[model samples]
Target chain A: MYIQVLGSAAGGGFPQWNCNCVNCKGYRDGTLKATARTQSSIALSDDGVHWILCNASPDIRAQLQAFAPMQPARALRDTGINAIVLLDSQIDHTTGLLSLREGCPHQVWCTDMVHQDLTTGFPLFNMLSHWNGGLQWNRIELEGSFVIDACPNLKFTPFPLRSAAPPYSPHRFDPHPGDNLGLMVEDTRTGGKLFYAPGLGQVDEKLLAMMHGADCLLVDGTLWEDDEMQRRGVGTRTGREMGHLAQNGPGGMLEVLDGFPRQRKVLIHINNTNPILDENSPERAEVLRRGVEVAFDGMSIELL
Target chain B: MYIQVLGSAAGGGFPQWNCNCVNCKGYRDGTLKATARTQSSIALSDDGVHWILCNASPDIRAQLQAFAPMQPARALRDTGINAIVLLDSQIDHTTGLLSLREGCPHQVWCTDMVHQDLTTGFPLFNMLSHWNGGLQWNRIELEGSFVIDACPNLKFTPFPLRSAAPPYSPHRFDPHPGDNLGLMVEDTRTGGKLFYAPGLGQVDEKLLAMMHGADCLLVDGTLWEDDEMQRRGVGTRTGREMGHLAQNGPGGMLEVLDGFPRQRKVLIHINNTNPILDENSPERAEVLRRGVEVAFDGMSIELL
Candidate 1:
């Protein structure tokens, strides 16, 4: 199984846009020993032929342009991205669909709740309906298994994640089931199972149960400390409050992943304000000490 | 007066996301002697401190990130972009507005026609409204002059251009008066001026008169030939039919630019298939020999 982490930073990307947090500031000043990251997204494939993109980052155009694996290398106007699976309806996760707009139809897989959010307030799907071959939405039944077209070697099952819907959601405050999802992608050919979730508010028993049998676990690492943004005076809400599990303190993402010692644990979707972005920071060292990997842009994983 | 070309390519950018034309293919294959450009956007300012962005490209985040002039150098959560002025409501032109969303009110200047398209069909403003302070829209009357709030040394005048509305517009085919605009920016501090129209379907006397008085001219250069896309089998419509003035043929942009010999004539909003993108090509040489520069990303202009 080939898994490629296209971008590993949260919303606005590492060093975001206007953010002047320590990590952002230091990186710009060239004093920080850290790599820049675009928004978080990943691509998975059993063979290199047909790949399924996990999430479409707003930086999708540039991401695809940079990665030759996803480009139209063979044909004149073709792409390896067979289908796109969106886990949530956040602006970062779904806005790229606008860039991906074409006369050709796109096979998009998402939860009914996400499709509802996109059609209503956020309305990416609604806006796109005006153009040519619009999104062909495939309902992802929560905790239900499905197979991608053509690539029968891969199987995908999604489980409900503890995260709120975007602000524009009709039930923003009052979240619903399947509002957010964590995908379980398995290579039916190799029998190699992988757990993927870039947005997780809590490390529940359901997640732990799935992580147990996984060969590799890719999870959110938006912040080093829960109140990292608040402490830096960059944002009002904490990481946990914003639907992300931080990396430090008593029972956080690091400790959660520590439980699955045998599995290959990796952290992605890191925030710009997170100290862990600084390679020289103690937070980064702490994450590495926990027998977990910090994902970066263009990082590739070959699960055997 | 300072003018920086943040991104100098048309809609999907040079070597567009899914494009596989000669230019796009050669660029990706590393055989083309050309620099990759983002979507069309330019920042104009009398002093480098305060900037007024002309058209928000979908690549705005990455554009701003690459150019240090637009970043938050001093304060956290701040930007040098004093205001954003939209020329049209096309998906490529206005989609970047989503990335520019913030809790703070943004001063966005556009014609009523564009505001209508954005509000109803595209509905970026609508989606953003559910969040904190939505777009603080300021009407730009057709052929009317105005000044940016903070930057008193700059004056902006908008003139109606010949271009149809976006696909989603209620008046898509039947274009309105203010559906598209070409900006005439004058620096009160330096007595230097610029005429910019990246999506020009027609070059009427109004455009000529505007171009006549400017220190520099940035006009549409979407295709080398009017039927460049058609000949390449990339699309059905000619460049002119799609609301862009091509550079070649008897009396295209190059000839028009030749008449204005004294002014610093430049071409922007170049399409991916446009032959001018290939530096080693005859089309690029033709542009250079005619004293017109093919605008590139991060190309800075200081109007003396």
Candidate 2:
């Protein structure tokens, strides 16, 4: 399985547009040893020709252009990305759908909850019809395994995770387990399994059970500490309150991943305020010392 | 007066996200001599410390970063851009508002028609209030002049233009002259003026009269020919029907500008299919020979 980390930053991306944080300023001044990243997204392909996007960021256009295989081959409007799998209904995860309006009839896989949020909460699905580019949506049953309708070579099973509704949702008060999910993707040909959970409020037993035999794990690293945002004076909320597991602290992801047996443990969907994104920071050194990898835009991994 | 062309392409931008047209392909293969441009936007400043964006594209985040002065200075969310003046309610001209939710409290200037469209048609303005960023909106009176509330060093007068409303607008069928506009900006200090009209349907005498004594003129160049879209099999609409005046043809912008007395007659908001974007194309050579300039991203001009 060929996996490409198209973007590894959180909602606003690393060095976010309006952020003048130390890391952001460092990036602008070329003083930081870090790769500038867009919002969180990943591209996976069994072979070089066909591809599936895990999440589409608002920066999707630039991301697609950067990855060579995703480019069109013959037709004027043809794209190698055959399908898209959305995990949540966050604006950052879905606004790129507007850009995709040009190429209609996109095959999309998401939870019914996300579909509901997009249709009623955000209404992007309804608005897309105006573009005349067809959109086909398939609902992924929670904890139930299903084969991709368009690409049968891959099997996908989504397990519910603790999370809240997108802020724009009218259903924010009634959060559902399906509001967020960790996808377990398997290559039917090779039996290689990869677990992806870019948004995790807590790592429960079900999550561990799913991660036990995974060949690779890409989990959330939205903040270094639970109160990183508040501490930095950027926001008043904690990472946990925002539906992301902090990367540090007693109950953070590092403690959980320390005992995990996965061969490849990586952190993605990092926030601009996360000091770990600064390669020269001590936070980054500590993250690397724990036997985990920090994902960057354009980073590639091959599952054997 | 210091003017920076933040983006120089039409709606979808040069080498649009999903397009694989000749120009788009040339850019993808690095065979094109032209520089890649985002959607239509421009940043202007008198002192260079504070900037005002003319139109915010969906690509605004990237465009802001590309231009140095627009970067945030001291605070985490502080931006050098103090105000935004929207000329229309098109998706390309307004979707960037979502990106700016993080940096709230922007002073926006627009026509009453645009404000009405935002409130009733798109409603992003109402939704932005939820971000707690304190947005101050001031309506511009058509055909009348006013000084920028925040940037008093410049005076602005908006003239009615021939155009249709955005597709998503409820007012699309009720095309109003106020739906689009040409902003005539004057430097209070230098008395130098600039005429900016990124969307134009017909060059009426009123528009011509407004352009009479302008130091610089940045007019629409959405299409090279009226039927370019149909000829290229891209779409069925002519430039005129789409609310843009073509740059070529009998009464196109070129012919209109031939007798104009503006010192700097420039073409902006060019489409990817326009042959003039290609420096080596005869169309481009013709434009240059006619004493007109093609706007490019990051192209700066200073009027003394």
Candidate 3:
């Protein structure tokens, strides 16, 4: 299994606009030595014949152009992105799907809640319907594992999200969270399992055990500490305060990462303000010190 | 002076592409009402003719369309904006300046470093120079505090940024960190002063004392805490971690304001994650409780 990280930064991407934050400043000055990134990824088979895209990040067009190029054979229609599997229904995570609107007819796999949320709230769905666009929407029942027979070597199995239940959802008008999930993909022939969970609220003992068995794990790295929101005056509650665990707090992944005991653990969906975007930052060093990796634009990893 | 918030959210604006975060979810569901904003803002005098724009946010065109619909007479000549001023050269802060190339000749004010960064990196300034054939670039040495007598009731005083240095700036790359500054505008006739510093790092005793005297203060609310970056472990160090203060940290604005004795404090350039943008978050309540106002799209404050 080969996973190529198209973007590592979370929403708005690293070096967020008007944000003169140290990392952003470094990037603007070219001192950081990084590339402007989009917010998504693509998974390719070992033979490189089959391509499956996760969420379509806003930088999809550029990402596709960079990865697949504009070859006649690599036309959006012929570009091997046979299927687009959605991990959750966040705007950054999902709107990139629109880039595929004119490309070709493809299937989108998500939970029923996400299906309902997109159809109701996303005007693009209506626009696509109005335009008679071709897109197949498939609902993946929670805890139900499925395979993509379309690709010979690659397969996907979605796990129920920890916070999939309602009442804790942001979509709920009165502050009720809704159903969300992450997928666990396995490379059938090698018995190698890779877990992809960008919006994971919390990684528990069970999740740790599960990750321990995977060849690669891409988990959420939204904020460094729980009180990050409060500390930065970024305008929100702490990550843990809001239910999503911070990457560095005591209970955050930094302190609690040992339970997983995995060789290849990666931090994905990084926040723009997160110091981990800078290699010179201790935050990145600490994560790296733990044998964990930070995903970057176009960074590819072959599952062991 | 009237302060307008072109785009409130951090990077993707309000209802971002695929964000399932509370803010995005709320905006998409309509449960959290919001406006489609591009990052841009303009400050107009009481009579409404004197205009000085803040950062040329990426959404300037749309912002003008929504906030300042120009008459055909002026639209043909000025493209709706009488004069353009830039705070820093972040993408969201400067990209929208390109939108000006289409209709009329406008002037952009920034430090030489900003100009060099833009030209060398994205070639934005160079593109503007070649666009339709050219763009007027006005280089301002923030030191002498320039004057634009071109507009009625408009005067600008550019003060070097004190509290905050560039985000994660290394002495090697960004030599003169104090190159950034806040704009202090005063009406010639009314003697009304509007101090706008939408991007702040840490407010010290002296700086806080100066801004406290202003009638209206537009400040930065980028992060909730200072150690926000350290906790995230993404790779870059934050101001606090690098010796600067965050909005809600130990030396944050809210605490500093206790001694600020200002007439009105309105937080602008708010990130999407900021709960102060929310109608329900207690952080907003705390800010309001402290008598601080939050900037919103098309929100006009009439100083009688």
Pick the lDDT winner: 1
Q: Per-residue CA lDDT of candidate 2, range B167-225, in tens?
A: 66677789877788888899988899998888878887767876887889888888888
Worst 10 residues of 1 chain A by lDDT: A236-245
lDDT of 3 by residue, A186-218 (tens): 888888888788776776667776777777777
* Candidate 3, position A144, lDDT: 55
Off by over 4 Å in 2: A241-243, B241-243
TM-score of each: 0.97, 0.95, 0.50
* Each prediction's DockQ against the real complex: 0.64, 0.56, 0.02
Candidate order, TM-score descending: 1, 2, 3
When summed lDDT is taken over every stretch of 10 residues in candidate 3 chain A, the lowest stretch is A68-77
lDDT of each: 0.83, 0.81, 0.59
- Candidate 3: list runs displaced more than 4 Å: A30-35, A42-46, A69-77, A164-178, A240-243, B1-304
In the range A51-106, model 1's lDDT, one tens digit per residue, is 88888888888888778878745766677788889998888888888888853467
Which 10-residue span in candidate 3 chain B carries the lowest summed lDDT?
A: B69-78
Writing each residue's lDDT as its tens digit, candidate 1 over B1-304 gives 7889998887778777777789888887888899999998998877688888888888998899878878746787888888889888888888888887753467889999999988888777877886568788999988569998767888898877767887778899888889877888888877888888887776777668768899989887888888888877777777554446677867788888878998898888888888888889998999999999888998998785
